[PDB]
Paper text:
One such highly networked epitope associated with control is QW9 (QASQEVKNW, HIV-1 p24gag residues 176-184). QW9 can be presented by the disease-protective HLA-B*5701 (hereafter B57), but also by the typically disease-neutral HLA-B*5301 (hereafter B53). Here we examine the CTL response to QW9, a highly networked epitope presented by the disease-protective HLA-B57 and disease-neutral HLA-B53. To explore the molecular underpinnings of differential cross-recognition of QW9 and QW9_S3T restricted by the two HLAs, we next determined the crystal structures of QW9-B53, QW9_S3T-B53, QW9-B57 and QW9_S3T-B57.
To further evaluate the C3 interaction with QW9-B53, we next solved crystal structures of the C3 TCR in complex with QW9-B53 and, for comparison, the C3 TCR alone at resolutions of 2.95 Å and 2.3 Å, respectively. We were successful in generating a QW9-B53-specific CTL clone by single-cell fluorescence-activated cell sorting (FACS) following peptide stimulation for 6 days. We sequenced the TCR and transduced the C3 TCR into TCR-null Jurkat cells which were generated with CRISPR-mediated genetic knockout of TCRα and TCRβ genes, allowing us to evaluate the specific binding of the C3 TCR with QW9-B53. However, one important observation revealed by the structure of C3-QW9-B53 is the mostly preconfigured conformation of the CDR loops of the C3 TCR for QW9-B53 binding. The major change in the complex exists only at CDR1α (RMSD, 1.2 Å) and to a lesser extent at CDR3β (RMSD, 0.68 Å) due to key hydrogen bonds formation. However, the rest of the CDR loops, even CDR3α (RMSD, 0.38 Å), remain essentially unchanged. Figure 6a–d shows that it is the internal hydrogen bonds within these loops that largely restrict their flexibility. Importantly, the structure of the QW9-B53 restricted C3 TCR and the trimolecular structure of C3 TCR complexed with QW9-B53 revealed a nearly rigid-body binding of TCR to pHLA. Notably, even the TCR CDR loops, aside from minor alterations in the CDR1α loop, do not change their conformation, which might endow the binding with an entropic advantage.
Author numbering:
A (entry chain B): 2 to 243
B (entry chain A): 1 to 203
The structure:
Amino acid sequence: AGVTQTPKFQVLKTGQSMTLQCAQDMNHEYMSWYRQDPGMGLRLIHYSVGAGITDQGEVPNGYNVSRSTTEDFPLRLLSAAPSQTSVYFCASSYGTGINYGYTFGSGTRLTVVEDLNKVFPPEVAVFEPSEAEISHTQKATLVCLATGFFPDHVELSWWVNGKEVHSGVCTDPQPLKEQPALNDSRYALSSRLRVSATFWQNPRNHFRCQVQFYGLSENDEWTQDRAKPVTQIVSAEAWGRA
Amino acid sequence: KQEVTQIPAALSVPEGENLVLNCSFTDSAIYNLQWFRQDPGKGLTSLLLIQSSQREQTSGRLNASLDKSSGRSTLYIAASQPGDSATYLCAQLNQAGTALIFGKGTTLSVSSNIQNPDPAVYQLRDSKSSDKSVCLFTDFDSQTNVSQSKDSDVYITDKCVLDMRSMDFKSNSAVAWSNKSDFACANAFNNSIIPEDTFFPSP
C-alpha cells in the first residue's frame, strides 16, 4: 500500500521527451505531481481528482498528465529543458475530506543537459587510516572519495568483509561541486568508516567502498572516445595492515 | 494567492533540547495541515496530520499545535536527537480542497554532544592517484564550524557525525583533499575557525 514512481533517476538531453510513471494500489481518487527545487519547496504541477479528470497546478507549463485509470497518473515532459532539472514527487489521497492525508512516492531525480558529453561516472578511491590517528585515538578512519561524476545520481555504501555496514559510517548528505559556478559542474562525494585500531590491524579484514552511479541507458547513442557512462558500480578496496 | 510560510528556514540546536518549528498560512475555513520529513535524496514521510477541527496532534516526541484563528501552526520536537536532523515540510490543503500547498521547509540540524573533544587533522595515504592527498578533520566538538576555504584545487566537505555502536562513541569529521603542490593537506582548515589546541601531526 504505497505510491511507486519510476524511474528513480533519469538523465535527459535537451529536447528529449520522457514520461514519469506513478501508480498507487490504495484506491485513492486524488493524485498530484510536484517538483522540488533548492529554496523553492514543493511546487504543484498537475493534479487529478478522479479518472478522466485533470487540472493545472502552480507550474503546469512544460508538462502534461493523463488519468485514464484510478491507479496510474503519468507525467509527460514535452521537450526536456535545463530548467526542468528537479526532483519530481507524486502524491495521492483518498478523497475530498480533510480527514484524509497525502502519501508521497520516493521521487524521481531528473537532470537535463545540452549534450550527453557532460555525463561522467565517478572515480572511487579509498584512503587508508593514518598512523598518527591510530596512535593518538586507537581508532582508524577510512575515507572513500568519489570524484568527477555527473550528474549527482549516486549511492555510496560500505562493505566490511561481506556485510554492508552502517555503524561507524557517515556520508556527506550532499555532494559538492568541483566547479561551483557551473550548472553542469562535476560532483565529488566522500564518506568515512571508522573502526577500532585492532580491527584495522587485522590483515584478514577486507574493506570495500562502492558507489552506484545512475547514468545512460544501453539504448542511448555514444560517439565519444571514452566508455559510455552507463549505470554501473565503481568500487575501491583496502585490507587491514598490521 | 495561497501562501504557506515556514520559519526559520534553517535551525541548528544541540541535542537534548526541545525545538519549535513554526508554520503560518493565509485564509481559513476548511483545511488540514500535514508535516513531512525528508532525508537528503529520499522521499517525503508523513509525520502528523491536523484537521481544522483540532488543536493538538501528537506522536512520540512530536507535538503539532494548530491555532486556526491566528493561522499559525507549530511542530514541537521534545528532547531532540541527532537522528532528527532532516528537512521538515509544512503543507496546507487548499480551499477546494483538492491539492496540497507546501512551505519552503525547515532544514533542521541537531548537533551531537561530544563527550571529550579531541580535535585533530590527520593525513591519509593514497590509492589510485598519485598526489591527491586526502585528510580528515575529526573529533571536534559541535560548536566548531568548518569553512569551504579559498584555493583553486582544495575542497572541503561539510561536517559529518558517525556513531560507533560497539564503542558508544560519536565523532564529527570533515574531509579535505587537493591535487595542487603548494597545498599540504592540513593547510585547508587553518583558514577556518579551528580550536587553538588542535592536533596537527606531520605525516
